[PDB]
Design a protein around this ligand. Structure first.
Ligand code: ZT3
Ligand code: ZT3
Lengths: 395, 390
């Protein structure tokens, strides 16, 4: 009576994250869900052996099957090349995948009642998305710096005067943003808001950048009114623009559970996701915000006890599986993903947590061994509680 | 015999912050320290009556006496204008003072062992300072470029920012003067010397080779030419790091450093002028209108005065550093210690108790109202100064 998941692209990672990735697969995903997996080993040894071809293949597989779950991988550096005898310093796999797929990264945090957070009034999680992919020069002495735009259809050149240096030099810069990138950011933001069922809020200081940020607001409103308005009204959700100063004041006294889309001109506690949403609203790429956890991997190699938080990695699987279920209309898979998120949260709230989580409640030095469980005990408790939850749900 | 403080400019605030400001003055500062006060009422009613002239006079008094402590004030808006019948919605007093004085704002956090931290490893506070200070829509395809025509007659240098392909978009041009960077560097070094902590300049110069490379160059040359000897004498160092390398080192650190970053109730905002003599301290929180309305309704209030107390201590510490006063410097540090120890001992306000016991699991016995907390602080301060006379 296994749940038929469907086509999901999975990628193995490195060090402690690879170990916990195998643990989540063997204990939580495989015993209940049967998938048409497209496994790709993104381990530094396999990446070196295939000349980083496996990353390009995995990215192509995601573009074809729209669902991809990724484990934490190492970005090579000088010491890493010497450590693994790497042929060359390969580029970050996340960067390659992001370049091939394209889209906006939305970071969601996992909130537990007993876990202390800033504000403390935020019961529901917050999703924040920043737009992403500049020319600079040094001004030697006094002069006049100005930006010009000559249209490639005759017309007339427009000269704006950025500044007039009278005493002393300095430095000047000039950036830009294409309309297609803003349109894609707007589409990704609206599709994320529809997938999560939460209201969207665009925050920008349009008072300072009247034409720059005013354009952002105009494109967002144009797309909202032309396609997503009816869908937003049907699900009781709404889109409202707000100023950065007004937005932070509104958010601090609000409930939570809102998609915040902010303009780009970390919290690696193991409680955050990094969902890449493509503008088409069909291709997703879920991964954990934290790194490979090398510190714990060294202890694991030495045979020492480790207490690693797998919540971010589990939530990366649940988000990918929820998106797969939403695409293929799989009620059972969607329920399974929600059940796994609930078992995770409830287990932490019940008192069973790792050392990093217990360090917040009892204090980092005051953490005793009885207060927390090591990686394997926590995963075993999660599996036990998951089995119980699914057994009780067959009613 | 009270400690001889000296010339300090004090600016009265509004609402709950004004109430706690009067409480700190009458209970913690005046009974032990005798000051040459230069009081200025920055109340919305006084600001309206004088046509915001009091703000300019207070800013001038700060420039003259080099030390200023400010209480939280209201920034007018539509609702405030209607409720107070204002003549005109005045500019933010902080903006006016910042324009007259200049300088860099450094935000410092107050750390207590029992209070949960954003980073578990941070035991000592970290000070963060940011550098604070033309756009247009591109209708269709074209070529946007930035030009520079020197005033000495040399040839104009043109840099292509983007040749707009199919479809337009939007563009902008930013600038920064050398004097602003020089003043930011001086303020950062003087702050690091006053706190006795190492300074770290963090920026992403890989992308901005010329822009952020200039920042690193100016900060390297003022440090090497003037502040190197003073930094070496006090065992302090200045190291420039990339933003991605800086977050990795800072995460694995106990704190206690001055972080100067260039921008692309437990916080104190200290404005440090480039001259290293003028400092304006203030609490990094609002007027607390939510508690003032309860106060007006006769309801019990539990407001945290730690940020306001720390604004006084920082101003008094800077005054002591200028006048070479050992007694006043000790008093300011003693007041910070009594504040921290009182919170750590279990005596705290409702907002602080909400972090340790959980917001919904907070009972009356766990916290004290504004007056009880101030009385406990005063009692413990008296004890601390009595024990220190050895
Ligand atoms: C990247 C990211 C994603 C999601 C979340 C966060 C972060 C950092 N966090 C957060 O407080 N965002 C935040 C909100 C406001 C600010 C201010 C102070 C600048 C106004 C700063 C950070 C963690 C947090 C905790 C509890 C509930 N939700 C969240 N969501
Ligand atoms: C404005 C400000 C100034 C100083 C401080 C803070 C804030 C908010 N705080 C803080 O957590 N800043 C912080 C800085 C960097 C990061 C990174 C690592 C994500 C880049 C995270 C938080 C409060 C805090 C608490 C304990 C000890 N020091 C501080 N200093």
């Amino acid at each position: 009576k296994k749940i038929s998941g469907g086509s999901v692209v999975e990628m193995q990672g490195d060090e402690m994250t690879r170990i916990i990735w195998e643990l989540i697969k063997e204990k939580l995903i495989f015993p209940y869900v049967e998938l048409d997996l497209h496994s790709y080993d993104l381990g530094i040894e396999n990446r070196d052996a295939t000349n980083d071809q496996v990353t390009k293949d995995a990215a192509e597989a995601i573009k074809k099957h729209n669902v991809g779950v990724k484990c934490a991988t190492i970005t090579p550096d000088e010491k890493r090349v010497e450590e693994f005898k790497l042929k060359q310093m390969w580029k970050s796999p996340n960067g390659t995948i992001r370049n091939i797929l394209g889209g906006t990264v939305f970071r969601e945090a996992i909130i537990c009642k007993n876990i202390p957070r800033l504000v403390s009034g935020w019961v529901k999680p917050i999703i924040i998305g920043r737009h992403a992919y500049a020319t600079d020069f040094v001004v030697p002495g006094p002069g006049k710096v100005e930006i010009t735009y000559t249209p490639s259809d005759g017309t007339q050149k427009v000269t704006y005067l950025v500044h007039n240096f009278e005493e002393g030099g300095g430095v000047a810069m000039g950036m830009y943003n294409q309309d297609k990138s803003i349109e894609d950011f707007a589409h990704s933001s609206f599709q994320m808001a529809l997938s999560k069922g939460w209201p969207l809020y665009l925050s920008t200081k349009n008072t300072i950048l009247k034409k720059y940020d005013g354009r952002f607001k105009d494109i967002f409103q144009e797309i909202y009114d032309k396609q997503y308005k009816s869908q937003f009204e049907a699900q009781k959700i709404w889109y409202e623009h707000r100023l950065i100063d007004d937005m932070v004041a509104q958010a601090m006294k609000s409930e939570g559970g809102f998609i915040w889309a902010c303009k780009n001109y970390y919290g690696s506690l193991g409680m955050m996701t990094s969902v890449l949403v493509c503008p088409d609203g069909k291709t997703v790429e879920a991964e954990a915000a934290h790194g490979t956890v090398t510190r714990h991997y060294r202890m694991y190699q030495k045979g020492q006890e480790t207490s690693t938080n797998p919540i971010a990695s589990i939530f990366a699987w649940t988000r990918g599986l929820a998106h797969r279920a939403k695409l293929d209309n799989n009620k059972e898979l969607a329920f399974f993903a929600n059940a796994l998120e609930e078992v995770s949260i409830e287990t932490i709230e019940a008192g069973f947590m790792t050392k990093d989580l217990a360090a917040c409640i009892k204090g980092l030095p005051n953490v005793q061994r009885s207060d927390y469980l090591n990686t394997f005990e926590f995963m075993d408790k999660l599996g036990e509680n998951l089995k119980i939850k699914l057994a009780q749900a067959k009613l």
